[model samples]
Target: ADKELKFLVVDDFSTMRRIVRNLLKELGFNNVEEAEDGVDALNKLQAGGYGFVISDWNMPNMDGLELLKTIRADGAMSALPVLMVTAEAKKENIIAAAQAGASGYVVKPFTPATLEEKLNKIFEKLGM
Candidate 1:
């Protein structure tokens, strides 16, 4: 019943993009889109209809942090839920993401369970 909510998965690697999309599919969420970088993600975000974002921290053009900041600052999408799924596990990076207004954060090499857990946490917080 909840499949109507669209999700955007942003990452530079094709394999990781496929993995996240596959995991979301396994979770019964098929309304998903992909972007290779923050710039592309922002463009899609501006296009509308996305309810959530799963982004990588490090990218060639406009990293996840910048994207989060941009989303948080946008009047139309200020409250968008952004979950950072990245290889950067540093304490500072996590702090920065939180400060940048990320709804949730997941480090790389995460299992399906972890992804599910994080997604559930964000959904719960948003009451969605």
Candidate 2:
């Protein structure tokens, strides 16, 4: 992926947001921003120029699933890449997410290598 591709790291907790940002930095991406939840993420996304989304599944105001659905249903960024990260491993939830157009899904406690591969995988499918 292009190093200039802007990323939005979304999580309810501040620490998780920063952690994802740090991993993004390790991947040589510095053009990163953050959102605390789905609502915040939507607002930032509406402002435009975000190429990627790394989001947590659970949050207040709006959850990641709703966020993903909204993005897919909206015209402006319907095809934008969205990678879901969460501690939940429920098969049902994964099914719903895939059916809703999730670009990728990452389980919690990931490493730099894991994050790196997830992005590459998404890029490969999208031909980025």
Candidate 3:
């Protein structure tokens, strides 16, 4: 189901961006793009054609939480799938993300298999 899906990966660290992209590729998703932060991610999103968004919680300009809220409040883009991948593993943060309408929340230091599992779980639960 993830095949052919266009993905936006947002992170301030270029290394992390590459890592996520490689992981997505390994998962059979080839149409992945990167952004430095939520602002950059939103810019790319406005350009359109994105099927899913994978973003880090902390970034230079605008954070993943803010981006998720923006997407939720936007009438046109409200239904877009957003998965938060971050180091913020606290229960409070997880609850906040869920309240903000995140499609999935994945803690950082995750392996390829973990990423795959989280993504699959989201798809399964969300019926996507």
Candidate 4:
């Protein structure tokens, strides 16, 4: 991915958001911002300029799945990459996310290497 591409990290917990932000930084992506939940994420996304999304499945105001669905439905950002990160491990949950158009999915407590790999795969698939 281009270093200049901006990423929006969305999660309900401030600590989780910080962890994700730091991981992104470690991946050499310094152009990143944080959103508390889906509603906040949508507001930032609709304002334009975001290149990617890393979101937690559960959140207040709106959930990550809802966020993904909304983004996919929107004409302007329908093509933006969305990576879902959560503790949910059920097959149906994963299926729901994929059906909702997530570019990638990761379970919670993921390692840096796993995060890097998933990011790389998404970029590769999109030819970024």
Candidate 5:
């Protein structure tokens, strides 16, 4: 089921986006797209068919937290899963992300194993 899922990787940096996209591919998710910011990500989201989102916390125009809030607030896409891969490792940020409806929150400079673990945890929680 995880392999069948389509993912959106959002980040302002092309390098980070590529990293995440490649990581997803390595994890067996071949269907993945990249976006530079929340606006771009939201556009892709509204295009439909995406099962998950892995986004960065900091970006110009719109950030991960704002994007998460936007998705959760939208009636049509409220249930879409979102995972934050950010440098914001503080407990407050974690709690805020959780409360704002993020599916998972991971700090930056994480390992492939960490990414895999977080993806698996989200999958298990979603009963995928």
Candidate 6:
């Protein structure tokens, strides 16, 4: 029931990108693309092939907050689903991301079980 969903993973570091990407496939969401940063993410998003986005809250060349806001601001992708990935528990401020229109937030190094549950929550919330 979930294989069709397309996921985009945004992270400057290859570590998180690879981790998240593999996790998605592990959970059976096969359609995925990797974006190095917000700029590239925005470009690929504009091209229109993703249903969900998972990204780190911090990055170079346009951070995640800016990227989330831009997605909310854009008419075409305004309602896109985005989950902000917090690298550390200390800097985690999901409230701002909620205000900025993030679908949800998840701390880095989430297990596949945790990730799947979060994604399920989003899909349930959106009725998608």
Q: Which candidate gets the maximum TM-score versus the true structure?
A: 4
- Which sections of candidate 5 miss by over 4 Å? none
Candidate 1, residues 88-126, lDDT tens digits: the string is 689999999988889999998999999999999888877
> Where does the lowest 10-residue lDDT sum fall in candidate 4?
85-94
Which of 3 and 6 is ahead in lDDT? 3
lDDT of 3 at 6: 96
Per lDDT, the best of the predicted structures is 4
Question: Per-residue lDDT tens digits of candidate 4, residues 1-128?
Answer: 79988999999999999998999999889999999999999999888889999999999899999999999999888899999996957898899998998999999889889999999999999999
CA-lDDT, candidates in order: 0.91, 0.92, 0.90, 0.93, 0.91, 0.87
TM-score of each: 0.96, 0.96, 0.94, 0.97, 0.96, 0.93
Higher-scoring candidate on lDDT, 2 or 6: 2
Q: Comparing candidate 4 with candidate 5, which one achieves the higher TM-score?
A: 4
- Where model 2 places Cα greater than 4 Å from the true spot, the runs are none
Better of 1 and 2 by lDDT: 2
Task: Kindly list the per-residue Cα lDDT of model 2 for residues 9-28, writing each as its tens digit.
Answer: 99999999988999889888
Each candidate's number of clashing pairs is 0, 0, 0, 0, 0, 0
lDDT of 3: 0.90
- After TM-score superposition, what is the CA distance of residue 67 in candidate 4 from its true location, in Å? 0.2
**lDDT tens digits by residue: candidate 6, 55-117:** 888889999989999999998998889999886655447778877888988887788888889
True-structure RMSD for candidate 1: 1.0
Question: In angstroms, how far off is 41's CA in candidate 3?
Answer: 0.5
